[PDB]
Design a binder for this molecule. Structure first.
Ligand code: CA
Ligand code: CA
Ligand code: CA
Length: 280
């Protein structure tokens, strides 16, 4: 069933997590390194690459930063596995871990630092699929033996789609992504898409609201550009962000219990091996 925006404040969300008795959670981060990032900054990052490093922070650095300031409490041990996808070394088939022997980022300061160190060494490629990053998350959950996890994907939302194709027929990248979201709902996993750049967002919204085959609504879309573009205080922007990111988490947590996913090994999850970071 679909999960609406049931909470109008961060406070309501924390109470809702309180009533549901959330005691433990961990984060997983995935980062879109596809070529489309070079042109989805046309309006919102002044015709620059969304991954372009400079004196100003790019939307990815901004999103990492706010995630660290608003969501760090939801990773119980401050160690965050981070993965990249869609560069020339992974295309639409694989992900790579930020560090060689899969070692984790200690805190989101290191996530930000490691991102900065990695990105200019990457050939941004494609095609764009969320299938590998979601399948990587699935493997992290299955290996922890059903420990509750939130996958945060920071991306520009431009999954390789058909066009024009009226049809209702899906590109392989889109179909595999939907298949992964469906399969993911056999595990105690929440997905939050932090959308950066110009969009368009119709497809992310469809992942958010309309996938009939999945066991429960396991996917939330946060339009990061739209929240940051508001004429509000920085403190109010972070609250709006945290509220958007967490909106579906209490019902999703509860759903993992009602559907008997939490703490349970599914036994039917392919083990995805991350590639090493393609760097020096
Ligand atoms: Ca962790
Ligand atoms: Ca949703
Ligand atoms: Ca939603």
């Amino acid at each position: 069933s679909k999960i609406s925006d049931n909470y109008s404040s961060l406070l309501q969300v924390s109470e809702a997590l309180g009533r549901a008795g959330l005691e433990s959670s961990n984060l997983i981060v995935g980062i879109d390194f596809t070529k489309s990032n070079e042109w989805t900054g046309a309006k919102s990052f002044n015709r620059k690459s969304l991954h372009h490093l400079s004196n100003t922070p790019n939307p990815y650095e901004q999103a990492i930063t706010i995630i660290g300031r608003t969501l760090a409490a939801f990773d119980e041990d401050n160690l965050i596995p981070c993965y990249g996808f869609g560069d020339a070394s992974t295309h639409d088939q694989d992900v790579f871990s930020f560090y060689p022997e899969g070692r984790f980022c200690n805190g989101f300061e290191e996530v930000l630092a490691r991102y900065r160190e990695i990105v200019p060494q990457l050939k941004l490629a494609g095609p764009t699929s969320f299938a590998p990053i979601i399948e990587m998350a699935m493997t992290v959950v299955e290996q922890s033996s059903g420990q509750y996890h939130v996958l945060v994907i920071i991306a520009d939302g431009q999954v390789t789609r058909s066009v024009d194709t009226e049809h209702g027929r899906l590109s392989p990248q889109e179909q595999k992504t939907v298949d992964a979201i469906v399969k993911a709902s056999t595990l105690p996993l929440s997905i939050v898409l932090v959308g950066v750049g110009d969009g368009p967002w119709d497809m992310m919204q469809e992942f958010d609201d309309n996938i009939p085959a999945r066991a429960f609504d396991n996917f939330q879309f946060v339009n990061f550009t739209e929240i940051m573009s508001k004429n509000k205080d920085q403190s109010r922007k972070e609250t709006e962000f945290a509220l958007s990111a967490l909106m579906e988490i209490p019902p999703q947590y509860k759903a993992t219990i009602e559907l008997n996913l939490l703490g349970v090994r599914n036994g039917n999850i392919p083990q995805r091996i991350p590639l090493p970071p393609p760097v020096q």
